[PDB]
């Protein structure tokens, strides 16, 4: 007997045609479109396509409510707790509504989706309670515009709304046009939970409504969905000062070693087939099996796939539900129709909006199917010989979200996990989720983390704001020739190099005295710098102890030249440079201090084992330094970045480049490995877009302006970007460590 939907139908009948939830109240239904039960084809309800006026009103109401909401963290905790209790009290209603609207089996909705949504609100209540005392340097961002996809409608909502509210923000959230109903029921319980009017606003519609929210007067945009829409959102928000997080999917590799627990690995994969759909953090869709066990693994997998029950999603015995929409069914059919590689196995399928579990095996590591987005309940598989080859195959995509590794050997499992490019690695499991355990992407899977203490920073800003110094025009001078050799070069790959373009500009002091010449770098110089950083990839695998020693040497060797650097700064700016040099030394010693002390965090989880939220390098960072603070600006950005294991290329102060060029000798004397620090001089108008666009850079920090160009160009490979504020007089070290690291959460067995 299937689960009863009587209560869900009664709620839908009560709500009638839906408007929006704005300012604590339901608005009149407008331009209606149907949401259809994909398993039956029946219209469940009519919902409104929001207008620009609706989105304006939602954001206005969220803004009006936010300062009172931000004031009392203890009060927010009570509301978040109440929301969790109402999710639990109405768990069966939320679960049936999710199954009706999305097509997923009721057993998944009841066992996975709703309990994790409850736990997300229970857990994040405590962050609201603790924000004032445990995050005293932080404050709410304001209003968050939030946009989510169709695959896990309620749980995606929880992942967005719970941290935003905990940190004193208000939200305007739009569910996917195919799956609006559980978000509307969430709206309908907000009053009962004591959510103050306008703290939560839910508007419905398709991508055009998403676009309105993204471009509205919000302080943050948080998006989960397709990579292409992620790029458009990054472009649409460029130069606006909005905070942005993007979780962009990319189905993860599932690595099965010769010594894996085969039957547990098979059962984990078959139990993940329905789950691994849409843009969710998951692993299993890309199967990588060591060649010694590959035939046996595949044979067992196909028979376990046969045991999956496909049919009525309201039947609690069903494992494979209905596809979310005919458009998605067509997408999966078309993907399979376009593939000619490998051997395709499909289980039986019932008639209608159902697609069967499908395994495409015998693929080569270079096959396009191993690299393209995979749609539907479809697995693709290839083999590997060595663990090193498994790592190479797993990392040979544009994505980097989650991964799974199966091995019974204590060494092999924990050796492979840090080598995989991913935000999450599950050992001997997959799709393990908890509110305390952060998740999110790298590369074209996006940026930002959701869950844990780590997920909170992106919903906050400094309690005391800094402001970047104004740009400073370079001084001019008469232009008489220079009989001495005072033309500074570039510093790339451990040695000084001429600028590829051959040009240098005269540098003058405040009264017109010629001080020297500085190179004008170009895109070919930047390319050479990126190649040097690629050759220095070993730096990102060094010990913190080693990196600390190098930074200590840089600090010592700068100190030995302190008077000289102060005189150079005074020559260029007319103002005494001793305080700036002392601060630069201090930043180096603070970065040296941190190099082996920026600890990952161990999460107790109510699941098997523990989650290790590790700190890893971002990788290769291009940095543009402000005009002011010709030494301190450069050192303040360089030092925490390399302390965390990054390689960097810095565009030094455009106005005052000669302190940075004097610094080349310090880098050489300090035995900084070739390519770990590279320095370009010249016009940031020449360099900003090339650095932000570069597809082989992992992050761009633009602290000299050009924020719109930099943030728009960063969409090419979706690198992380930071455009300030950055005040070199302020000690930003701790904040910069966060810009300079990624969180990778490794889930390990633990008694």
Ligand X SMILES: NC(=O)c1ccc[n+]([C@@H]2O[C@H](COP(=O)([O-])OP(=O)(O)OC[C@H]3O[C@@H](n4cnc5c(N)ncnc54)[C@H](O)[C@@H]3O)[C@@H](O)[C@H]2O)c1
- What are the catalytic residues? 247, 281
Q: Which is nearer to ligand X, 148 or 158 (CB)?
A: 148
- Judge whether 331 is annotated as a binding position: yes
* Binding test (CB under 8 A) with a copy of itself, winner from 37, 66, 129, 460: 129
Q: Which is nearer to a copy of itself, 124 or 620 (CB)?
A: 124
Give Cα separations from 573 to 576, 627, 657, 661, 696 (angstroms).
Answer: 8, 11, 11, 16, 35
What are the beta bridge partners of residue 221? 145, 244
Closest among 8, 105, 588, 594 to 309, alpha carbons compared: 105
Q: Which stretch binds ligand X (CB under 6 A): 27-35, 171-179, 360-368, 667-675?
A: 171-179
728 sits near ligand X (criterion: CB under 6 A): no
Backbone angles phi, psi at 570, to 5 degrees: -65, -40
342 sits near ligand X (criterion: CB under 6 A): no
* Binding test (CB under 8 A) with a copy of itself, winner from 45, 181, 413, 518: 413
206 sits near ligand X (criterion: CB under 6 A): yes
596 sits near a copy of itself (criterion: CB under 8 A): yes
Site for ligand X, residues 129 to 148, rule: CB under 6 A:
147-148
Q: Which is nearer to ligand X, 176 or 193 (CB)?
A: 176
Size of residue set near ligand X by CB under 6 A? 16
74 sits near a copy of itself (criterion: CB under 8 A): yes
C-alpha Rg value of the chain to the nearest Å = 27
Q: Closest residue to ligand X, Cβ-based?
A: 210
58 sits near ligand X (criterion: CB under 6 A): no
Backbone angles phi, psi at 212, to 5 degrees: -60, -45
- Minimum distance from CB of 249 to ligand X (Å)? 9
748 sits near a copy of itself (criterion: CB under 8 A): yes
Q: Does residue 38 sit in helix, strand or coil?
A: coil
For helices 578-594 and 632-643, give the axis angle rounded to 10 degrees. Answer: 10
Contacts of 596 (CB under 8 A, 6+ apart): 543, 544, 545, 547, 548
- Minimum distance from CB of 160 to ligand X (Å)? 11
- Residue spans of beta strands (DSSP E) within 220-267: 220-224, 243-247, 252-256
- Judge whether 279 is annotated as a binding position: yes
Closest among 655, 656, 662, 622 to 491, alpha carbons compared: 662
- Minimum distance from CB of 176 to ligand X (Å)? 4
Q: Which is nearer to a copy of itself, 52 or 409 (CB)?
A: 409
Q: Which is nearer to ligand X, 233 or 551 (CB)?
A: 233
Please check whether residue 20 is in contact with residue 201, taking contact to mean a CB–CB distance below 8 angstroms: yes
614 sits near a copy of itself (criterion: CB under 8 A): yes
* Binding test (CB under 8 A) with a copy of itself, winner from 190, 213, 427, 635: 427
- The partner in contact with residue 751, picked from a copy of itself, ligand X, none with C-beta cut-offs of 5 to 8 angstroms by kind, is a copy of itself
Q: How far apart are CA 329 and CA 322, in angstroms?
A: 9
Please check whether residue 293 is in contact with residue 262, taking contact to mean a CB–CB distance below 8 angstroms: yes
416 sits near a copy of itself (criterion: CB under 8 A): yes
Q: Kindly tell me the sign of the dihedral angle through the C-alpha atoms of 177, 181, 183, 187.
A: positive
Chain centre distance of CA 637: 21
- Judge whether 150 is annotated as a binding position: yes
240 sits near ligand X (criterion: CB under 6 A): no
Closest among 408, 743, 747 to 609, alpha carbons compared: 747
Burial class (CB in 10 A: 0-12, 13-18, 19+), 480: exposed
Q: How far apart are CA 134 and CA 157, in angstroms?
A: 26
Q: How far apart are CA 542 and CA 529, in angstroms?
A: 20
Site for a copy of itself, residues 152 to 171, rule: CB under 8 A:
none
Q: How far apart are CA 558 and CA 498, in angstroms?
A: 24
- The partner in contact with residue 354, picked from ligand X, a copy of itself, none with C-beta cut-offs of 5 to 8 angstroms by kind, is none
* Binding test (CB under 8 A) with a copy of itself, winner from 343, 563, 576, 599: 599
Q: What is the largest CA-CA distance in the chain?
A: 95
414 sits near a copy of itself (criterion: CB under 8 A): yes
Please check whether residue 460 is in contact with residue 141, taking contact to mean a CB–CB distance below 8 angstroms: yes
185 sits near a copy of itself (criterion: CB under 8 A): no
Closest among 229, 190, 271 to 21, alpha carbons compared: 190
Q: How far apart are CA 519 and CA 500, in angstroms?
A: 9
Please check whether residue 180 is in contact with residue 147, taking contact to mean a CB–CB distance below 8 angstroms: no
Binding flags for ligand X, 213-232, as an x/- string (CB under 6 A): -x----------xx--x--x
Q: Which is nearer to ligand X, 248 or 314 (CB)?
A: 248
Q: How far apart are CA 152 and CA 662, in angstroms?
A: 55
- Minimum distance from CB of 206 to ligand X (Å)? 5
Binding flags for a copy of itself, 524-563, as an x/- string (CB under 8 A): -------------------xxxx-xx--x-----------
250 sits near ligand X (criterion: CB under 6 A): no
Closest among 409, 410, 405 to 394, alpha carbons compared: 405
What are the beta bridge partners of residue 323? none
- Judge whether 134 is annotated as a binding position: no
- The partner in contact with residue 418, picked from ligand X, a copy of itself, none with C-beta cut-offs of 5 to 8 angstroms by kind, is a copy of itself
Closest among 159, 172, 54 to 455, alpha carbons compared: 159
**Annotated binding residues for NAD(+):** 148, 150, 174, 177, 211, 226, 279
**Annotated binding residues for NADH:** 148, 150, 174, 177, 211, 226, 232, 327, 331
Q: Which residues bind ligand X (CB under 6 A)?
A: 147-149, 174, 176-177, 206-207, 210-211, 214, 225-226, 229, 232-233
**Annotated binding residues:** 148, 150, 174, 177, 211, 226, 232, 279, 327, 331
Q: Which residues bind a copy of itself (CB under 8 A)?
A: 74, 77-78, 81, 119, 122-123, 125-127, 129-130, 133-134, 407-411, 413-419, 427-428, 436, 453, 543-546, 548-549, 552, 586, 589-590, 592-597, 599-606, 609-610, 612-615, 731, 734, 748-751
């Amino acid at each position: 007997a299937p689960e009863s939907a009587k209560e869900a139908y009664a709620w839908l009948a009560e709500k009638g045609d839906f408007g929006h939830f704005i300012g604590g109240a339901w608005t009149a239904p407008g331009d209606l479109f149907a949401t259809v039960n994909p398993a039956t084809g029946q219209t469940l309800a009519q919902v409104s396509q929001a207008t620009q006026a609706d989105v304006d009103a939602a954001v206005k109401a969220a803004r009006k409510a936010q300062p009172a909401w931000a004031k009392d963290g203890a009060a927010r905790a009570r509301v978040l707790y109440a929301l969790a209790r109402l999710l639990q009290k109405h768990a069966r209603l939320f679960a049936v509504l999710e199954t009706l609207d999305n097509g997923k089996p009721i057993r998944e909705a009841r066992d996975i989706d709703v309990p994790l949504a409850q736990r997300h609100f229970y857990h994040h209540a405590g962050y609201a309670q603790l924000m004032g005392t445990e995050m005293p340097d932080r404050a709410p961002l304001g209003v968050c515009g939030q946009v989510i996809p169709w695959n896990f409608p309620l749980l995606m909502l929880a992942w967005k709304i719970a941290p935003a509210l905990a940190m004193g923000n208000t939200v305007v959230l739009k569910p996917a046009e195919w799956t609006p109903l559980t978000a509307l029921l969430f709206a309908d319980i907000c009053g009962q939970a004591g959510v103050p009017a306008g703290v939560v606003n839910i508007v419905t519609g398709d991508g055009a409504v998403g676009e309105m929210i993204v471009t509205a007067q919000v302080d943050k945009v948080a998006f989960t969905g397709s990579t292409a829409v992620g790029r458009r959102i990054r472009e649409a928000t460029a130069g606006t000062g909005k905070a942005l997080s993007l979780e962009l999917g990319g189905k993860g590799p599932y690595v099965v070693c010769d010594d894996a627990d085969i039957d547990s690995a098979v059962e984990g994969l078959v139990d993940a087939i329905w789950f691994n759909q849409g843009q969710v953090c998951c692993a299993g869709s890309r199967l990588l099996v060591q060649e010694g066990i590959a035939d046996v693994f595949h044979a067992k997998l196909r028979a376990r796939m046969d045991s999956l029950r496909i049919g009525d999603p309201l039947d609690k015995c069903i494992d494979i539900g209905a596809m979310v929409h005919p458009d998605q069914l067509a997408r999966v059919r078309d993907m399979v129709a376009a593939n000619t590689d490998g051997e395709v196995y499909q289980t039986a399928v019932p008639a209608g909006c159902y697609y069967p579990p499908t395994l495409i095996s015998g693929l080569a590591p270079a096959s396009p199917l191993m690299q393209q987005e995979i749609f539907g309940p479809v697995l693709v598989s290839t083999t590997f010989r060595t663990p090193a080859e498994a790592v190479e195959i797993a990392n040979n995509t544009a994505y980097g979200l989650a991964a799974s590794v199966w091995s019974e050997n204590v060494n092999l499992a924990l050796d492979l996990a840090p080598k995989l490019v991913a935000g999450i690695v599950w050992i001997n499991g997959t799709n393990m989720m908890d509110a305390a355990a952060p998740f999110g992407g790298v590369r074209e899977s996006g940026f930002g983390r959701e869950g844990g203490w780590e997920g909170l920073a992106g919903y906050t800003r400094p309690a005391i704001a800094t402001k970047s110094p104004a740009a400073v025009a370079a001084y001019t001078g008469d232009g008489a020739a220079d009989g001495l050799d005072r033309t500074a070069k570039l510093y790339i790959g451990g040695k000084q190099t001429r600028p590829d373009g051959g040009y240098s500009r005269a540098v003058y002091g405040p009264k017109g005295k010629l001080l020297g010449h500085a190179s004008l770098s170009n895109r070919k110089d930047l390319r050479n710098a990126v190649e040097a950083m690629n050759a220095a990839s070993g730096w990102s695998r060094t010990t913190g102890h080693l990196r600390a020693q190098i930074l200590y040497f840089i600090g010592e060797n700068l100190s030995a030249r302190a008077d000289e650097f102060a005189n150079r700064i005074k020559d260029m700016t007319g103002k005494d440079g001793k305080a700036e040099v002392a601060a630069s030394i201090d930043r180096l010693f603070s970065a040296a201090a941190w190099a082996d002390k920026y600890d990952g965090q161990v999460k107790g989880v109510p699941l098997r084992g523990v989650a290790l939220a590790m700190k890893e390098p971002v990788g290769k960072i291009g940095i543009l330094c402000p005009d002011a603070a010709p030494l301190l600006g450069l050192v303040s950005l360089m030092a925490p970045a390399i302390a965390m294991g990054n390689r960097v290329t810095l565009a030094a102060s455009e106005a005052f480049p000669l302190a940075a060029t004097d610094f080349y000798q310090v880098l050489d004397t300090s035995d900084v490995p070739a390519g770990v620090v590279n320095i370009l001089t010249g016009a940031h108008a020449d360099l900003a877009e090339p650095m932000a666009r570069h597809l082989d850079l992992d992050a761009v920090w633009g602290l000299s302006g050009h924020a719109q160009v930099i943030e728009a160009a960063s969409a090419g490979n979706l690198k992380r970007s930071w455009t300030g504020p950055f005040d070199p007089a302020h000690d930003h070290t701790r904040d910069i460590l966060s810009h300079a690291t990624e969180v990778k959460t490794i889930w390990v067995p633990y008694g």
